[PDB]
Amino acid sequence: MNIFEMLRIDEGLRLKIYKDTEGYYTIGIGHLLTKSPSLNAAKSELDKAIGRNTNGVITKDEAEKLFNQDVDAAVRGILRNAKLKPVYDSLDAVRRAAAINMVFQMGETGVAGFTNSLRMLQQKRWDEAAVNLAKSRWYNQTPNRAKRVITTFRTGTWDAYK
Numbered sequence: 211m212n213i214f215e216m217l218r219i220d221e222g223l224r225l226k227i228y229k230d231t232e233g234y235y236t237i238g239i240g241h242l243l244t245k246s247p248s249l250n251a252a253k254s255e256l257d258k259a260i261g262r263n264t265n266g267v268i269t270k271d272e273a274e275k276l277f278n279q280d281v282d283a284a285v286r287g288i289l290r291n292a293k294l295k296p297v298y299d300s301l302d303a304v305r306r307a308a309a310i311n312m313v314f315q316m317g318e319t320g321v322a323g324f325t326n327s328l329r330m331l332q333q334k335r336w337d338e339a340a341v342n343l344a345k346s347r348w349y350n351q352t353p354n355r356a357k358r359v360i361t362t363f364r365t366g367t368w369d370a371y372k
C-alpha cells in the first residue's frame with residue numbers, strides 16, 4: 211500500500227464525466243473538473259487538462275496521468291502551506307499519506323477547519339486526534355472513507371485498506 215493505491219481505492223476510476231459526492235463534475239481518479247453546474251464548462255476544463263477535444267471521455271492512461279499530477283500538486287501544496295508543513299513533516303510516511311488523502315478530497319481550504327486535529331496529530335496524541343477528526347462535516351458526509359483515513363492516522367498502519 212501507498213498514497214496512489216490508497217487514493218485509487220477511495221476515489222475509484224471512471225472514464226466518463228461523473229458527479230462526485232458533493233455533486234461536482236469530476237473524471238478519472240477523483241479529478242475535480244469544476245464546481246460549476248455547467249457540463250459544458252466541465253467539458254472545457256477536461257479538454258484543457260488533457261490537451262485535446264475529449265468530448266467528456268478519457269482513457270485509463272490519461273486518467274492516471276491526471277492522478278499523478280493531482281497527487282504531486284497536493285503534496286507540494288502541503289509543503290508550501292505554513293500551517294500544514296510542520297505537522298506533515300512531523301509525521302511518519304503512513305500518516306503522511308493520510309494527510310495527502312484529506313487534502314486531495316477537501317483541498318487546503320477544507321483542511322483549514324482542522325486546526326485542532328492537526329495540533330493533536332503533531333502532538334502524536336493519536337486516539338484523541340482520531341476522536342477530534344470525526345467531529346466534522348467531512349466524517350458525517352463521507353463516513354466510510356473518513357473512518358479509513360482516521361484509522362490510518364490512529365494506528366500508522368494500512369489496516370483499513372488491507
Ligand SMILES: Clc1ccccc1Cl
Pocket residue numbers: 288294295297298299308309310312313321324328331
Ligand atoms: Cl496536510 C494535513 C491534512 C490533514 C491532517 C494532517 C495534515 Cl499535515
